[PDB]
Amino acid sequence: FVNQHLCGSHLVEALYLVCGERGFFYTXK
Amino acid sequence: FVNQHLCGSHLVEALYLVCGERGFFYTXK
Amino acid sequence: GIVEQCCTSICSLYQLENYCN
Amino acid sequence: GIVEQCCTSICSLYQLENYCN
Ligand code: NA
Ligand code: NA
């Protein structure tokens, strides 16, 4: 699911799934 | 959509929608 | 943290915006 | 940033994990 173009909610979802209990930061534009 | 219990992907989604171009940080547990 | 405030208790816009950059 | 690497170009696990805390 990670090896594609991921934008918007799709990208946030991938971060959520990959990072798990670590959490993540999303900083766009 | 924000005034409820929000867990996991549901919480990430709310952050995404609310924060917009600002982005956000998700740090759980 | 955010889980305590928004997942195991009811979330708020006020609280969510504290996690925007 | 992440948009340039994962949205307008093809994302990778390698890149995504750089944004985990
Ligand atoms: Na997985
Ligand atoms: Na909205």
Experiment used for this model? X-ray
Rounded CA-CA distance A14/C1 in Å is: 22
Which residues are paired to C20 by β-bridges?
A: B24
In whole angstroms, how large is the CA radius of gyration of chain D? 8
Resolution in A: 1.2
Cβ-Cβ contacts under 8 Å, B5 against chain C: 6-11
Rounded alpha-carbon distances, angstroms, from residue A3 to A9, B4, C7, C9: 16, 33, 30, 35
Q: Closest residue of B to A7, CA-based?
A: B16
Q: Determine contact: A12 vs chain B, CB below 8 A.
A: yes
